[PDB]
Amino acid sequence: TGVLTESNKKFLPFQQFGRDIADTTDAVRDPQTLEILDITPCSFGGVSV
Amino acid sequence: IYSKHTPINLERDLPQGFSALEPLVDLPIGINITRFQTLLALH
Ligand SMILES: *[C@@H]1O[C@H](CO)[C@@H](O)[C@H](O)[C@H]1NC(C)=O
């Protein structure tokens, strides 16, 4: 779940994924069109009363 | 079959530096290999 944005990461042609240090997927490759998408989590935060 | 091509200055020995070997082709063969040989092109 997230926001798929355009990316300027220079993927090698044999690389499909990019990984965060917490082993979560940061970038993905579209299997239909050879493009790279950045995954960013949606807007969230804390609420104080 | 990891591969890399690198320019060299002269022909004494291996240079000093880090050339990362990118993967090139993966083969699904899966046979028993214990010995190997290299051909030469003789004219
Ligand atoms: C699948 O889509 C890609 C890009 O749209 C296209 O190049 C490819 O030919 C398609 N494959 C088939 C079997 O139609």
- Sheet containing A25-29: give its strands across: A3-6, A36-40, A25-29, A18-19
Strand A25-29, strand A3-6: pairing: unpaired
The CA distance from A6 to the nearest CA of chain B, in Å, is 25
Is A31 near ligand 1, meaning CB less than 6 Å away? Answer: no
Method used experimentally = cryo-EM
Tokens of B41: 């092109």
Cα separation of A9 and A30, whole Å?
14
Question: How far is Cα B3 from Cα B18, in angstroms, rounded to an integer?
Answer: 14
| C-alpha–C-alpha distance, residues B1 and B21, integer Å | 10
Q: Is A48 in the pocket of ligand 1 (CB under 6 A)?
A: no
Whole-number Å distance, alpha carbon A35 to ligand 1 midpoint, is 14
Which residue in chain A has the smallest CA separation from B2? A14
